[PDB]
Amino acid sequence: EEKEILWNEAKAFIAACYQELGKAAEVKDRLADIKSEIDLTGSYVHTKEELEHGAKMAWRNSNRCIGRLFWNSLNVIDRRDVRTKEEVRDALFHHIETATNNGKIRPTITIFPPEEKGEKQVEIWNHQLIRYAGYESDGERIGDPASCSLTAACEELGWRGERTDFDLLPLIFRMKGDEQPVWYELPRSLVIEVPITHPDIEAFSDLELKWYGVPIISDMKLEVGGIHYNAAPFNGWYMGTEIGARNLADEKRYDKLKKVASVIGIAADYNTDLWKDQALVELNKAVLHSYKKQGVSIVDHHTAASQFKRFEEQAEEAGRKLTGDWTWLIPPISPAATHIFHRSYDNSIVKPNYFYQDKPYE
Amino acid sequence: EEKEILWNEAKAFIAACYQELGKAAEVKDRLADIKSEIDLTGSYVHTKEELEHGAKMAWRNSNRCIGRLFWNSLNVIDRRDVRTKEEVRDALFHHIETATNNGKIRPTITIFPPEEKGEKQVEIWNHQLIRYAGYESDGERIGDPASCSLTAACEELGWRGERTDFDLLPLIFRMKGDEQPVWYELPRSLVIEVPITHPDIEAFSDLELKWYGVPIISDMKLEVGGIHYNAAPFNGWYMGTEIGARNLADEKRYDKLKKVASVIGIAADYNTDLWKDQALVELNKAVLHSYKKQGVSIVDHHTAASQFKRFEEQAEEAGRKLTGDWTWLIPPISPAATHIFHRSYDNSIVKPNYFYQDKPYE
Numbered sequence: 001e002e003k004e005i006l007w008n009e010a011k012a013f014i015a016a017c018y019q020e021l022g023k024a025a026e027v028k029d030r031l032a033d034i035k036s037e038i039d040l041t042g043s044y045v046h047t048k049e050e051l052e053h054g055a056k057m058a059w060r061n062s063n064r065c066i067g068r069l070f071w072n073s074l075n076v077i078d079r080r081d082v083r084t085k086e087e088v089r090d091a092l093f094h095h096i097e098t099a100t101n102n103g104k105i106r107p108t109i110t111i112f113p114p115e116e117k118g119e120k121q122v123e124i125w126n127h128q129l130i131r132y133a134g135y136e137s138d139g140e141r142i143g144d145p146a147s148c149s150l151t152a153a154c155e156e157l158g159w160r161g162e163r164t165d166f167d168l169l170p171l172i173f174r175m176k177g178d179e180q181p182v183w184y185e186l187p188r189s190l191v192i193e194v195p196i197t198h199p200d201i202e203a204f205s206d207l208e209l210k211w212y213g214v215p216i217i218s219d220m221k222l223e224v225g226g227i228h229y230n231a232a233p234f235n236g237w238y239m240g241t242e243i244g245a246r247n248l249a250d251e252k253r254y255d256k257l258k259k260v261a262s263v264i265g266i267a268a269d270y271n272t273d274l275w276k277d278q279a280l281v282e283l284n285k286a287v288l289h290s291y292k293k294q295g296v297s298i299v300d301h302h303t304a305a306s307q308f309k310r311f312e313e314q315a316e317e318a319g320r321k322l323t324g325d326w327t328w329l330i331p332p333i334s335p336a337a338t339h340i341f342h343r344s345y346d347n348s349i350v351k352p353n354y355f356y357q358d359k360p361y362e
Numbered sequence: 363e364e365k366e367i368l369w370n371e372a373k374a375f376i377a378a379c380y381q382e383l384g385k386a387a388e389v390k391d392r393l394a395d396i397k398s399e400i401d402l403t404g405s406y407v408h409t410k411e412e413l414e415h416g417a418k419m420a421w422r423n424s425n426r427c428i429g430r431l432f433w434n435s436l437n438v439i440d441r442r443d444v445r446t447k448e449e450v451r452d453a454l455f456h457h458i459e460t461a462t463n464n465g466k467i468r469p470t471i472t473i474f475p476p477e478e479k480g481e482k483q484v485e486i487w488n489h490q491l492i493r494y495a496g497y498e499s500d501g502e503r504i505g506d507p508a509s510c511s512l513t514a515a516c517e518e519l520g521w522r523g524e525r526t527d528f529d530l531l532p533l534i535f536r537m538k539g540d541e542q543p544v545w546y547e548l549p550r551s552l553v554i555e556v557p558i559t560h561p562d563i564e565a566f567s568d569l570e571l572k573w574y575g576v577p578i579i580s581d582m583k584l585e586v587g588g589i590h591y592n593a594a595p596f597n598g599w600y601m602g603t604e605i606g607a608r609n610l611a612d613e614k615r616y617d618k619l620k621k622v623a624s625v626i627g628i629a630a631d632y633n634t635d636l637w638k639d640q641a642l643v644e645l646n647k648a649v650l651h652s653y654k655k656q657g658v659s660i661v662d663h664h665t666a667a668s669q670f671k672r673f674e675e676q677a678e679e680a681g682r683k684l685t686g687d688w689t690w691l692i693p694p695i696s697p698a699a700t701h702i703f704h705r706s707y708d709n710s711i712v713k714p715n716y717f718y719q720d721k722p723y724e
């Protein structure tokens with residue numbers, strides 16, 4: 001059955017990919033080649049062109065992503081050649097450096113060898129390559145609560161965090177044939193961070209907030225034509241609300257709205273004062289201001305929704321069905337101020353695509 | 363078939379309603395009575411108790427409503443006795459007066475005779491009993507664009523609006539056996555309105571904004587045990603975001619955000635300044651302030667979501683399945699600041715319930 005699933009996914013992907021690349025005449029011979037290879041080896045190997053376009057298609061098909069206008073300019077780094085943990089580590093360091101690009105962020109994906117018989121070759125434990133640790137013990141909470149379980153797993157392996165609110169987690173991944181993952185501290189010279197200040201309110205720096213420049217999701221599987229690339233970290237740039245309305249605001253994250261209210265000089269006593277809403281707006285203005293001031297790419301939710309509108313228009317004009325998840329596409333600040341809120345989207349799953357996979361710890 | 367649909371809906375409703383009312387022993391005899399009545403007359407008549415509880419159940423089952431905690435205190439006015447257009451008009455005037463209650467709004471529904479063979483006895487044309495007219499001609503737009511088609515229909519019937527931005531539409535409804543609806547101007551003494559001022563920003567009154575106190579939805583069908591009450595206007599009080607984030611803010615409604623930005627002293631030039639978000643927050647603070655200052659009931663979205671949380675808890679504790687439409691329950695301002703955003707809801711349709719029906723004009 002698994003070989004049949006593979007062959008069916010291969011046929012659909014190769015046909016679609018080659019149509020898009022103006023290579024339709026080559027589909028027949030390529031499919032034959034693939035079928036022989038599946039018969040003989042149990043799998044097949046993508047050409048560099050297939051792999052690159054497949055990763056782009058997968059972004060284009062990501063229903064929850066507002067940033068899809070730029071799908072065709074994804075920078076795809078092919079690292080199916082890695083075999084050692086030093087090679088993996090250096091590939092991840094390189095991804096950080098090249099994606100960061102001195103602040104002018106380049107959307108990038110690095111693709112490692114795919115699962116073989118559902119057997120991973122490289123298993124990355126980080127949720128993002130750059131992320132802050134979290135600690136909770138005896139009612140004492142430090143750092144990012146979303147990272148508590150991974151932080152605990154790292155400290156099981158001999159890592160020790162300084163227990164600031166912004167400890168950088170090490171890279172942690174496991175190689176096929178190894179029982180335990182290895183970990184490596186991130187060189188700080190590779191990691192851009194942005195202190196959060198407000199354009200008008202000088203006291204805002206008293207909160208001593210900061211965030212990292214580049215979100216690099218490293219725990220999703222890229223599936224392309226039936227091949228499962230479980231290790232394929234990718235990044236774009238942030239939309240400001242991710243940081244200002246969620247990472248720094250959620251009660252189960254950094255939970256900063258009361259502190260924000262205080263530094264902006266408003267009471268946090270009455271729901272009818274909409275102090276949470278006002279604090280959210282100022283924190284979000286500060287996040288955008290701060291990234292811009294430092295020359296680190298970021299997009300605000302209005303501009304992002306406008307770009308997404310163009311993505312919708314582009315899909316229609318290309319004759320492609322548009323899919324989307326309305327519940328994730330609306331921003332968490334002023335959603336009804338965007339066109340997204342006012343239309344609906346078909347949430348059908350189309351492949352290639354990026355998928356959740358089980359965490360190797362917890 | 364229609365008689366069978368009726369009987370099946372009747373059986374389900376009577377069983378459920380009588381269980382809830384501790385009247386389970388009476389179900390058998392009541393069902394027999396109903397079956398004879400359907401056989402003989404083609405329909406059946408609700409007892410006052412059934413009608414009242416049915417309207418409450420319908421509110422409780424309204425997936426899109428955040429205000430459902432208070433479902434059991436709905437004030438149900440039984441007007442199945444009306445036969446004349448003067449009686450309908452006076453019933454609607456009465457609903458306005460008693461629901462308004464000098465500003466201390468009472469959630470109320472007035473129930474008119476139900477459809478017979480799908481034949482309406484009373485057909486209400488208004489979307490809400492109190493609503494502003496809208497005009498569009500030669501690029502000139504006045505009032506509420508959402509009311510343009512109903513406004514045009516009224517002016518076909520001899521009504522003429524003053525063409526302020528806040529003309530009150532007349533009540534307009536049609537009686538069975540009449541070819542044209544009749545209309546009646548609303549007595550202004552029945553209609554409470556609230557001028558919008560801001561707690562801190564004196565210039566806000568320069569915008570000369572106002573809204574009406576009581577939203578009374580008059581174009582939905584109440585369906586209870588297979589009986590279709592197409593005319594059954596109901597009201598609660600507003601959640602402030604309905605007015606501040608939508609009615610006054612939407613580009614296709616009063617479109618006031620640029621004017622708000624100007625009076626609050628901020629530039630409306632750059633998306634990254636989040637001026638729309640800031641204007642939304644201040645307009646919404648003003649709406650809540652203004653209703654409170656005037657002693658007209660209103661709820662803010664934080665308090666409303668907290669009440670809705672209790673509704674969820676109440677349903678579980680009563681052993682009732684909860685249904686909801688996440689896309690409507692989240693407020694359009696700071697949705698991720700409410701618990702609603704962070705959970706999911708089963709959007710299954712359960713009856714009794716309120717349903718859209720086709721507009722008799724357009």
Ligand code: HEM
Nearest residue numbers: 059062064065066067107234235236237238239242299354
């Ligand atoms: C270029 C700038 C980009 C922006 C501004 C952007 C924006 C976003 C945002 C705001 C989310 C929702 C995140 C959340 O609420 O947790 C998201 C989800 C997503 N984005 Fe993008 N994105 C960009 C690039 C990319 C790239 C390069 C990829 C992959 C190649 C990608 C794939 C996805 C996926 C898979 C999700 C959904 C994750 C999930 O289901 O949990 N995006 N994007």
Ligand code: HEM
Nearest residue numbers: 421424426427428429469596597598599600601604661716
């Ligand atoms: C008591 C105060 C109430 C509050 C604060 C409240 C709040 C709301 C809000 C904010 C909406 C969404 C409206 C929109 O975005 O257009 C809504 C929808 C709704 N409410 Fe309530 N509500 C209340 C009472 C009632 C009552 C008394 C009923 C009926 C007996 C009712 C039935 C509904 C229905 C049917 C909808 C959905 C309308 C549609 O599908 O278009 N509500 N409610």
Ligand SMILES: N=C(Nc1cccc(O[C@H]2CN[C@H](COc3ccc(/N=C(/N)c4cccs4)cc3)C2)c1)c1cccs1
Nearest residue numbers: 067215216217219234235236237238239242356357358359
């Ligand atoms: N069953 C599961 N559900 C699950 C568990 C924990 C978190 C979770 O959320 C995703 C949502 N979202 C978070 C990641 O997605 C993101 C996050 C940020 C993001 N932001 C950006 N601007 C970009 C990052 C990379 C390219 S653009 C874009 C996508 C993380 C899902 C599991 C999957 C794996 C282990 S358990």
Ligand SMILES: N=C(Nc1cccc(O[C@H]2CN[C@H](COc3ccc(/N=C(/N)c4cccs4)cc3)C2)c1)c1cccs1
Nearest residue numbers: 429577578579581596597598599600601604718719720721
């Ligand atoms: N196919 C249709 N879809 C349609 C067309 C126009 C508008 C529309 O929206 C509903 C949404 N929503 C608006 C009414 O619902 C509301 C509006 C306000 C509201 N606010 C409150 N606080 C209350 C009013 C009454 C009790 S609480 C509560 C419910 C109006 C739906 C049609 C149905 C009828 C003719 S075409």
Ligand SMILES: C[C@H](O)[C@H](O)[C@H]1CNc2nc(N)[nH]c(=O)c2N1
Nearest residue numbers: 340341342343344689690691692
């Ligand atoms: C297309 C989308 O479902 C539509 O804009 C909805 C979204 N959620 C909403 N939620 C509420 N409460 N009211 C609305 O009018 C809408 N509009």
Ligand SMILES: C[C@H](O)[C@H](O)[C@H]1CNc2nc(N)[nH]c(=O)c2N1
Nearest residue numbers: 327328329330702703704705706
């Ligand atoms: C339950 C609900 O679907 C969940 O809270 C979602 C809602 N929409 C979201 N949208 C985005 N972009 N990111 C999120 O984490 C969430 N959370």
Ligand SMILES: [Cl-]
Nearest residue numbers: 215242243247
């Ligand atoms: Cl993030």
Ligand SMILES: [Cl-]
Nearest residue numbers: 577604605609
């Ligand atoms: Cl309204």
